[PDB]
Amino acid sequence: ADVFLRKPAPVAPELQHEVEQFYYWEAKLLNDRRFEEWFALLAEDIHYFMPIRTTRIMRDSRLEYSGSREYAHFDDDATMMKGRLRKITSDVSWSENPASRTRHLVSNVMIVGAEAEGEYEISSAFIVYRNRLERQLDIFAGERRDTLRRNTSEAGFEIVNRTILIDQSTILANNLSFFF
Amino acid sequence: ADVFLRKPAPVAPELQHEVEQFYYWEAKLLNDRRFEEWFALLAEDIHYFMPIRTTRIMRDSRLEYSGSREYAHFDDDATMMKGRLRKITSDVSWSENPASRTRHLVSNVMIVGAEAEGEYEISSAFIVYRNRLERQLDIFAGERRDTLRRNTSEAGFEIVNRTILIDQSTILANNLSFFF
Amino acid sequence: ADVFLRKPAPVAPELQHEVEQFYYWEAKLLNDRRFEEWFALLAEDIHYFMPIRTTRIMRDSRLEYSGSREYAHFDDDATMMKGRLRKITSDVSWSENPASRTRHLVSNVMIVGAEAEGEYEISSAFIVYRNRLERQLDIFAGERRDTLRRNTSEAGFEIVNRTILIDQSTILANNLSFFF
Amino acid sequence: WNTSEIEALFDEHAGRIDPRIYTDEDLYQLELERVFARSWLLLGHETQIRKPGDYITTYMGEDPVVVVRQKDASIAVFLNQCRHRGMRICRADAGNAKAFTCSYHGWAYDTAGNLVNVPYEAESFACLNKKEWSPLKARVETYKGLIFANWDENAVDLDTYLGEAKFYMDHMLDRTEAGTEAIPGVQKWVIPCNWKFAAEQFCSDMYHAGTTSHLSGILAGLPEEMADLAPPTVGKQYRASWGGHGSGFYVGDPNLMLAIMGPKVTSYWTEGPASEKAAERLGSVERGSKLMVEHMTVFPTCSFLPGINTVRTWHPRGPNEVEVWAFTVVDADAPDDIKEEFRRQTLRTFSAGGVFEQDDGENWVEIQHILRGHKARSRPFNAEMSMDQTVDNDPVYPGRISNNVYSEEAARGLYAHWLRMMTS
Amino acid sequence: WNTSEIEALFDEHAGRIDPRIYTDEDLYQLELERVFARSWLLLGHETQIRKPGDYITTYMGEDPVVVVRQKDASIAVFLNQCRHRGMRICRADAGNAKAFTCSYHGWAYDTAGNLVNVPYEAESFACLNKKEWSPLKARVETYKGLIFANWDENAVDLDTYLGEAKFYMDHMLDRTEAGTEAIPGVQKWVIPCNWKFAAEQFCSDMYHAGTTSHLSGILAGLPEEMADLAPPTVGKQYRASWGGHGSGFYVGDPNLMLAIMGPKVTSYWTEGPASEKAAERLGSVERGSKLMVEHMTVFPTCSFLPGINTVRTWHPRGPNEVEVWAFTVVDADAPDDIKEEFRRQTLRTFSAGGVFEQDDGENWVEIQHILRGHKARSRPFNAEMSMDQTVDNDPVYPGRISNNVYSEEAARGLYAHWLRMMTS
Amino acid sequence: WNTSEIEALFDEHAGRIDPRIYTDEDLYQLELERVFARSWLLLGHETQIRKPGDYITTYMGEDPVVVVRQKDASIAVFLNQCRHRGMRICRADAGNAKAFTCSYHGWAYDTAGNLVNVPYEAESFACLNKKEWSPLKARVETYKGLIFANWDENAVDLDTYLGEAKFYMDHMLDRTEAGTEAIPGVQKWVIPCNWKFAAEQFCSDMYHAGTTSHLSGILAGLPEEMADLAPPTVGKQYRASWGGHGSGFYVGDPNLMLAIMGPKVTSYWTEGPASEKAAERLGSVERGSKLMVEHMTVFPTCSFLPGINTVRTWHPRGPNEVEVWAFTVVDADAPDDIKEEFRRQTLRTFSAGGVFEQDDGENWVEIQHILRGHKARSRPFNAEMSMDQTVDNDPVYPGRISNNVYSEEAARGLYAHWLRMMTS
Ligand code: FES
Ligand code: FES
Ligand code: FES
Ligand SMILES: [Fe+2]
Ligand SMILES: [Fe+2]
Numbered sequence A, B, C: 001a002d003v004f005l006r007k008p009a010p011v012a013p014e015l016q017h018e019v020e021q022f023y024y025w026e027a028k029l030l031n032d033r034r035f036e037e038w039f040a041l042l043a044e045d046i047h048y049f050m051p052i053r054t055t056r057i058m059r060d061s062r063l064e065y066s067g068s069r070e071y072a073h074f075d076d077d078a079t080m081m082k083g084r085l086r087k088i089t090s091d092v093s094w095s096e097n098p099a100s101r102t103r104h105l106v107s108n109v110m111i112v113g114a115e116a117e118g119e120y121e122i123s124s125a126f127i128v129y130r131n132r133l134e135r136q137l138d139i140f141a142g143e144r145r146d147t148l149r150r151n152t153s154e155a156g157f158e159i160v161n162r163t164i165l166i167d168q169s170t171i172l173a174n175n176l177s178f179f180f
Numbered sequence D, E, F: 001w002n003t004s005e006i007e008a009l010f011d012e013h014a015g016r017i018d019p020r021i022y023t024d025e026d027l028y029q030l031e032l033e034r035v036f037a038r039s040w041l042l043l044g045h046e047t048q049i050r051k052p053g054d055y056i057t058t059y060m061g062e063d064p065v066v067v068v069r070q071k072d073a074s075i076a077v078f079l080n081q082c083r084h085r086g087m088r089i090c091r092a093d094a095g096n097a098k099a100f101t102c103s104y105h106g107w108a109y110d111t112a113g114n115l116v117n118v119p120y121e122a123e124s125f126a127c128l129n130k131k132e133w134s135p136l137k138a139r140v141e142t143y144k145g146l147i148f149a150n151w152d153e154n155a156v157d158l159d160t161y162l163g164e165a166k167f168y169m170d171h172m173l174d175r176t177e178a179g180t181e182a183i184p185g186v187q188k189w190v191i192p193c194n195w196k197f198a199a200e201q202f203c204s205d206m207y208h209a210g211t212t213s214h215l216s217g218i219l220a221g222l223p224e225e226m227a228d229l230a231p232p233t234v235g236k237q238y239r240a241s242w243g244g245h246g247s248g249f250y251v252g253d254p255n256l257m258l259a260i261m262g263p264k265v266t267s268y269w270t271e272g273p274a275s276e277k278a279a280e281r282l283g284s285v286e287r288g289s290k291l292m293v294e295h296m297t298v299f300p301t302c303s304f305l306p307g308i309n310t311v312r313t314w315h316p317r318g319p320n321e322v323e324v325w326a327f328t329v330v331d332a333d334a335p336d337d338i339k340e341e342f343r344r345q346t347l348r349t350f351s352a353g354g355v356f357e358q359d360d361g362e363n364w365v366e367i368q369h370i371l372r373g374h375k376a377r378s379r380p381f382n383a384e385m386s387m388d389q390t391v392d393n394d395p396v397y398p399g400r401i402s403n404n405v406y407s408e409e410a411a412r413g414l415y416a417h418w419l420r421m422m423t424s
């Protein structure tokens, strides 16, 4: 949103596809526990943000999501993320040893070029399916609002901003030890 | 179906994308509680239909879905829909105050041009994720068979027919207070 | 994987669409209980394989999926599949009489041309929603690694290999009587 | 739970309900045995099973049953469970059978659930008393199209059991010599709350419609008027003399009916040829043409709204959940477009996604969820509304009638009867 | 539940089962204590844990256990729960460990589950009796490749416990001096129905295969023949003298084996070098070469089908659900392509998605779902099949043998033993 | 459960816990009545409800409550359930109300949960004692920003109830005359394990942090050092004289604080102007500037980590599940960027997805899942850590203090008190 008040302008199909392909690749990386490569997709100025969400009466609805300087499920810079990667490369990281089985269905991908050259505002919808141990099953859905920046890498993009808009007030799982 | 007995003819990618984009936009509208704009997408001759579905023995399977003049989850014209919109703009609409958190994953989009100029028969698959209050979670899936008509609007299309084919016999939630 | 260690090369949009459309059609066939036509999509050298998956400590993680000569959820040639089709055309096939209600959301479709002319390695992500009887609901997710071969058929492709990579260790349903 | 403690749960003189009756698991089992096992329960409408061989499947408490039309057009009802190892005999919502065959080991049954023959009979079962080993049969008795069933050998017949409740059922069931057909399709949904909240509401809770519960559903049916809607204030409420049924209805004020059903139906219902025929049959111009909503419960779980014309059964699923199976009845001979109008309207309003029943779903769940707490279960609910406002000798309306449509006198009867049933 | 009432639940002379035994929560707990706590339960096959340090994790009732190969090649089995605050000691399905470390507070254990040392020992626990504070150990005893375990200090050894049931196990376990290996991979799935339905079926329920339960699974294995399939009618059924085991099998008729396993396996099993070696070892041409399916249960929850060669444990999950953990055994020395053939075939048929076990899944769930009802639990199930048709002195087959493969005599023994176990 | 048996469940002298206390459904109900019904429970922080009319909704056991700021700035707490038919009075997490209206039948309430008026009052309820029929009120007492509530008419006031536990709360709550505000946002999540595992850990379980539980979370906070991390060994642990509270903390060793909170916060906490002001107020240079983590529980379910500064309530959901509702407090007057630093850090570590609390989630679930087994519930857990190592007269620290930060003396007090509460 701000950006998405107006139905996005049509884009070249190879752009739509370039971006969709990015996300599919990114999902394969996460889903296949290729964390090292996934972190490489994070731009140096990465801002990885997932606001807490609350049940509000519809007049009060402007206060649904936690704001700028307010507690949140995640709100990480590159340094905080580095530490997190360092966790999921430990045989002593119990929440991911044994590892979760995750799936990221990605759809509803909408693209708007941003002010800067080679940057894009994206809205996509997801379901994340997290299965672990014998019988533990968690199903999340939401929206990812990203800012992507073009890149000399083999992937073609780096993730500058990510805002995960979860469809949950209370988190219905015992943790959030994977990445959206 | 009728229309979908034969694998659809290939279509120009910009048409595929034009339609997919329509649906993504439509999903954003529903999911972001922008109901007023969503109703604007409904064509004046809107027919919004979601048949009841039953567990049948496979010879009896032609009787799976409720028919033409038979009770149904929804079967609305423009006037009935207007009233429904008038509900979800009330601080006294309890089922949507506080509001549900919904997500519409949209995929499997198949397009066939209809008889009329600028009309299209569509088949798409969905999952709707409905989360509300503290811990209430409902997951629906099904198919939407739509007829879309081209348009001078900013959206580009109006919804003429919608048939929601739910994958449920008994409805596994305490209501259907959102829109498919 | 093997094939998917490196982000796939860009492909023509009509190829992306040709393949995506294949899958949507295939999903419609399965979801609409059109089993006879679905089996027709299976290439004569069909190898339909869904390994058992296990909870492993992350150093032991190369042993996550059952291997080549090891027990599995499915591991069928054309003859074994024919028999299975013969089951789901019986009023005495109880697990599919009455029939399941299934939905196949298909996304994250990535394509790499294979060695042979007109063959392709595909990775896609799925959710399968299986609803049956009154209140039975099962939700599976995973990845399908396929090899597709071009074709003179109306569908355009035959399925040569399918590897269903389920996101479950223990199967969380009382059977797997449908097709991934 | 000894009898003494079961008695404390509801206090009629004081007007108090112990919320444990909506939550306690053991009471729930007692209920299944002492209420559902001995009451007449609604299984559906006759026109749902027309030709011989036709069946539908539902529930009678939590026992699934098959409901089958016979060759002599009787209706057989048997427990839907093969006595061998308990497999489901009939495995579809509805269809037509010449016979039934258990899919586990192939025991076979006539359309009335008699075990006719058993594979390898001579070698393995030659002594099998096929009558003793047939699924349990229920007594079937219909009332003007509604199909009722009761397991109990010796309970009063449906007719005695209904008592003067028949009078009120007639407002919807007997407005023409043609009777009623059900529009095909039953809508089913799960609501996690105790069945009594649903039953009780339809029994006596006009209050909720006429206050805050459905303010938005009303607004949905009004032309492009706002929050200045006139709520009907003249009406009556009925409490059965025995058995815990109740009904309430508005008189004269067409405002709520207009919001729910629209002008076409409200017209059909109150003025013109069909309304007159009703007045004549019903013996009164008031009864036929002046009654504007009306809600009613036939105890325990049979509920409908004459005028709106949705019928439903509340299927209990433990103390904490209930399924709603609901359909819509029309006068068999009403014109095409009136029937269609009744269809579109009932589904637009009193359905899972209807602009009314949407909100009841949402409320009921909360009520139950709260009850999960300890202190929430430790004080009674208030059932003292409109006490001592009943004559039991009205010239026109039988039973215990009140002139305050906004009363919990009916509710009080429901619970008082539930109490009789539970303690006996 | 006092002893008297537990006795009423099953009546052997009359042949009747009280369905409450499949549903009652409290009986379920008694079962965990009086059945699973004192019986030999199947944990898997030896070749699943070959080298020292190898483990798998399963269950022994609802207690998770670690099953670990030791340096002297013994098999240790301990409760998979650290006695400190109950964390899971071993957290993977299978692998190889030099030691185990509790991930909550880091208590460490040898591959046999002895607590060897504890962080900050000297300061905090210096008095810690590390033997008393080690996880509970189970007795381990194997039988020709199958790994059994029992918590009970003083129960008869596996060998006495099996009794003459060994005779029938041998039909699959001892057809060669090479013994059996398990094809790697255990398939696990959840079936919401009581474990006894599964156990009982494998104990004595040939009836279901030979009637309507698997008509389509058979048709799937037949060449392009229809509904005119010859069901074998000659066979035998065995009821153990003590302990509740049972087995049944067809003799001579290769029709069902052909449909399930195909011609390659059926051949290997009945004619040629390997079949001869079996006949010799088994002491009989019939036993080795004439037996065509065969099903069997080692009470409570150990089940397999010699000839098809799927083995499984039924893991109880309350009265209303059971997990199936199943693998496939082959003669260790059978040729490459026979092994592969046994793999493809077992998974095509007796697996979660197999053309046979698909349908058992579907039935069993229904049985249980119905049982949710009151009247559904109030009358016995019929266990009177083929009464008084047993000699207990057959020249060849030990125990109580019958000539009717279609009998519930084995089933009757299972329940009679369950009854002994429950009331003691 | 008679009193005798409840006493056997925990043995303090021996140091043993019966794991049934974490699983038994009936004990759970007793707990709701004898623990949660009579204890002071944490509902949140004052700055969460600032202006008059502001409310938040939480739980006090499993009873939902509304917590509302009044015109005179008091805090009202009422059961969130209308006494009519039990609907939820307030239906949002947080907001501002002039009044509350029950959405079922429209009963209305002042911001303090008094029933002010009722639709159709004169006709239907004219006798309605609106005071008797208002939702149950709880006593509210705050301590330096934390809001506590207690249903119990006659329990000791929060101040007596806390006793010398206040001393330790002060380490976080009273480091400045400005007090503490809560960073806006409460994070909520479901953990299927018994609430006591969570409570007990925060009460006395430094052991888990200083061993294997959080090895990777520590490594995440370290510069690019590996598995050679120095764990603090000097510290103290406190067991309350009455009431079951406890706290433990490290002294002097800034290593763990650095890994969790980073250098900016650790600095602010131990050296410079703000640390000095704390030392002065707290009466000791040690208390203000030398304490490095610190964990603490105010019995039953109020828990926080002074220095890290996450606060939380453990909301019980039956014996098998608990919700965590957690927020973060900062000194009201600490600089901008320190507050922000406390925000980023607490969420990076002690949150649902935090690199520490991630792992506690995973462990706790396993503990509970295992407990589903029979043998898993049949032997006690070991609570004998660091026995008899307590003076009760330390010059500086009140109550029962030990010099071994690695002890279950606090835990032993928690359970001993739980035991007192349960048996009374
Ligand atoms: S259970 Fe129906 S024949 Fe066996
Ligand atoms: S519970 Fe395993 S060391 Fe504490
Ligand atoms: S329950 Fe709140 S007014 Fe009726
Ligand atoms: Fe595309
Ligand atoms: Fe209502």
Ligand SMILES: [Fe+2]
Pocket: E208, E209, E213, E214, E356, E357, E360
């Ligand atoms: Fe079977």
Ligand SMILES: [Fe+2]
Pocket: F208, F209, F213, F214, F356, F357, F360
């Ligand atoms: Fe921790």
